[PDB]
Ligand binder design. Sequence first.
Ligand code: HEM
Ligand code: HEM
Ligand SMILES: CNCCCc1cc(C#N)cc(CCc2cc(C)cc(N)n2)c1
Ligand SMILES: CNCCCc1cc(C#N)cc(CCc2cc(C)cc(N)n2)c1
Ligand SMILES: C[C@H](O)[C@H](O)[C@H]1CNc2nc(N)[nH]c(=O)c2N1
Ligand SMILES: C[C@H](O)[C@H](O)[C@H]1CNc2nc(N)[nH]c(=O)c2N1
Ligand SMILES: [Zn+2]
Lengths: 409, 413
Amino acid sequence: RFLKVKNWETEVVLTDTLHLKSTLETGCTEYICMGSIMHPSATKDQLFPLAKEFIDQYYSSIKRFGSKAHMERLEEVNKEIDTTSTYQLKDTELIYGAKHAWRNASRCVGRIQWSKLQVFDARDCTTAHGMFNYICNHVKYATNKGNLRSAITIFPQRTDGKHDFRVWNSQLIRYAGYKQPDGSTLGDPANVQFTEICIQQGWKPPRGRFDVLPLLLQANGNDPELFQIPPELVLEVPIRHPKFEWFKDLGLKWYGLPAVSNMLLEIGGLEFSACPFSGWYMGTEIGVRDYCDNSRYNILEEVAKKMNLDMRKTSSLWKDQALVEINIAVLYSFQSDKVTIVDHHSATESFIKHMENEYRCRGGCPADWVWIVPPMSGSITPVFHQEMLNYRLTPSFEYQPDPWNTHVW
Amino acid sequence: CPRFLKVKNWETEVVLTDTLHLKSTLETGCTEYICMGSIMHPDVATKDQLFPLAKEFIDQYYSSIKRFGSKAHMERLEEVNKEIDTTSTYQLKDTELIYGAKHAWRNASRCVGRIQWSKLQVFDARDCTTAHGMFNYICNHVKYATNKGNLRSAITIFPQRTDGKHDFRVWNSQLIRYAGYKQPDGSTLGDPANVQFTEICIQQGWKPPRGRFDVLPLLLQANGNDPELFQIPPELVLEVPIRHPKFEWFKDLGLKWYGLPAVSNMLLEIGGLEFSACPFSGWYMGTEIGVRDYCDNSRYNILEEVAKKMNLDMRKTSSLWKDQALVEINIAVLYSFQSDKVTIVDHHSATESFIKHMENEYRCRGGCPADWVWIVPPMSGSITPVFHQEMLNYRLTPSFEYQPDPWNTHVWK
Ligand code: HEM
Ligand code: HEM
Ligand SMILES: CNCCCc1cc(C#N)cc(CCc2cc(C)cc(N)n2)c1
Ligand SMILES: CNCCCc1cc(C#N)cc(CCc2cc(C)cc(N)n2)c1
Ligand SMILES: C[C@H](O)[C@H](O)[C@H]1CNc2nc(N)[nH]c(=O)c2N1
Ligand SMILES: C[C@H](O)[C@H](O)[C@H]1CNc2nc(N)[nH]c(=O)c2N1
Ligand SMILES: [Zn+2]
């Protein structure tokens, strides 16, 4: 059936037909919705229909469905799966696939940029040193002296499951976290466990609040190896406030490059277990989640002190006041340092425009309202009032297990 | 369906286990291929449809009072079936009515205030026959619930649906709301959300003051008849002038709001019986007024005016001038209610209470249906504990349901 989605602020109604194309599950059923669950829920025979489906939509996308090239490609892939239990994507197909996995990422508010993605083919990589080289080039390219460019580097696909390429870091660039004798945490508490694995492997920790973690890289199923990213490739921003001159004295900084490195890219049945991808930050990612989450840097109280706020009752909204000033500081700092960043008002605006584009040209746009709506000031951004349909389209980015739970040394 | 579903809290790592979802009775709107979790809204019962619905409810009631399988349970079942057989409907006992109303609230997945569910004053108005009688009952409800500012949650329940042509309806979506007036120049005076209803009232005879905060009259339909207008006695309408503890100029914006949130357009469904007029009221969470009523672009839309008086830079969105004004507006709302000693709850306190409620329900009941999209407040979401809490949404009965607007369906006599 055709599905309507309405914006309750503009009263614009869009019609979704694209959802009929989905074949994978969402996790919900007719009687139970799991819209707020973070993580809900090959062989030659499974492999061909998936490959065919993907080849079909690729050739449909270049207006040559059923062409001679198309027929030949299907045949070629058929033979290759027969003979080898897998197949290799053409360069054009790899790039199409990566851009579309981004396009189909229902949890990403930044998708208006989807067709501008620099794709680095790293499928000839065989070793951890090789991976390091490719990752450095990625970081250097994507960083671009502050003028951030979206990029993805794609390492060899899964074969038997015992020879996986994995970036063990959840992101390429992150700050270490340390468990103190007194039981508190120094640095980022989210990375305490990963930091410990790096230490256990030989990494000598400076034990600061913002120590960039080393890369831990696994090539072809082997034990991961440590590498320090050359520091001149790591762009950082000292956080200050345009009004509160005491803010710089908090000693806060963050890195300019958000680069997810723990997801799995799926294209036509093939699985790319190492595919680090990067864009640029939305201010709230740092200002709200990284700094103000209770389980992260957790700075609200200190900031509220410096602002001399009344902090005895919740109803003074001291937390909300402090939260806003921190996010002003993040945006101001990045902007003043000419490092690409987008505020949640601008980002959500662009996303609404993107939705409108996709509905017109594609017949829909899968979107996860729980993730799309920013973690502050929700209803004063346009996505809060936008109905969205969530469904799973392929090619796609998928979660995968942490490598330290499925690896034998 | 799996017998046990797990929900995680990503802040605390606490894992809870849901079994209550197995009692789900109606569709969410989702399927295994699509989720409609952010969709707002995704001829009577026949004898044969009614039997198992009544039995399911009666069983639940007698199970709740630890008399399941008792002689009184079996007798009540037989009496109910006999009534359905002879009359195609049945009547609830007062005890069952009260149980059903409290459970419809307990089951309302979109409500963050459910920690209070077992404390609800239920007014049985099933003997009501006329619009004048409806008015009396509604006035008594408003006075009781308001309690001079110490608000008490309450529901008044009018006669259930019979053949569908004799419905009792409150035409107002809430008992107390402000009028909206569209101007010839395209501007709106008052609350833009209420323009349609306001036009209906005017057509029905209401003389409008044409102000920014005019309390709408009640439009009351009894027994399927044409609806009639009544003015709520102004002394029964508690209102709060909004001022700010720091900004002396804030009171000069001339804002105020009413103290009692009272939903009057929902259908209460118990044991297959449908109560099409069941106005219920509680007390406000500040953000309902400070974020939605005042700051929605399609409502009073005051962010700009507040921003200008705050001397904020408003040329770039990146200054977060909107977020800054939003916080000060919400501070003022909470400060004004507390000062006038009218019950209100801030979004931090309410969401903290809701998490405790949810944990208790998982413990004692096997679960707690919750709609995250609605439970998370419209500002500062992730600094409230609910943002980090996975929730399962499913529909249990007794329940409050949406129903079409009466002016779209009414047959004018
Ligand atoms: C270019 C600027 C971009 C912006 C402003 C942006 C914005 C965001 C934000 C704010 C999130 C939520 C992150 C969180 O809360 O953890 C997100 C998630 C996501 N993004 Fe984007 N993004 C960008 C680029 C990209 C690119 C280049 C890709 C892939 C090629 C991508 C794919 C994804 C995926 C798969 C998620 C979901 C992550 C998860 O489920 O943990 N994004 N994005
Ligand atoms: C006692 C204090 C109460 C508080 C603090 C509270 C809080 C809330 C809030 C903030 C909402 C969201 C409203 C919106 O965004 O439009 C809501 C919705 C709702 N509440 Fe509660 N409420 C209370 C009492 C009650 C009572 C007494 C009932 C019924 C007996 C009730 C049933 C509902 C229902 C059915 C909804 C969904 C409304 C809809 O879908 O439009 N609540 N509540
Ligand atoms: C359930 N969440 C687990 C953590 C995942 C994650 C953590 C951080 C941090 N710090 C930062 C990110 C970056 C997400 C992202 C990715 C991209 C590509 C762009 C952008 N603006 N943001 C992700
Ligand atoms: C899609 N939403 C349409 C508007 C529904 C609604 C509007 C207002 C207002 N103004 C006020 C309410 C009151 C909701 C409510 C009800 C109760 C019982 C308590 C409480 N704190 N809040 C509802
Ligand atoms: C429980 C809930 O699903 C979880 O907290 C989600 C909520 N929405 C989110 N939205 C974004 N963008 N990122 C997140 O990590 C989360 N966390
Ligand atoms: C599109 C979206 O479902 C809609 O704007 C919802 C979002 N969450 C909400 N949450 C509450 N409490 N009240 C609302 O009106 C809404 N509106
Ligand atoms: Zn769903």
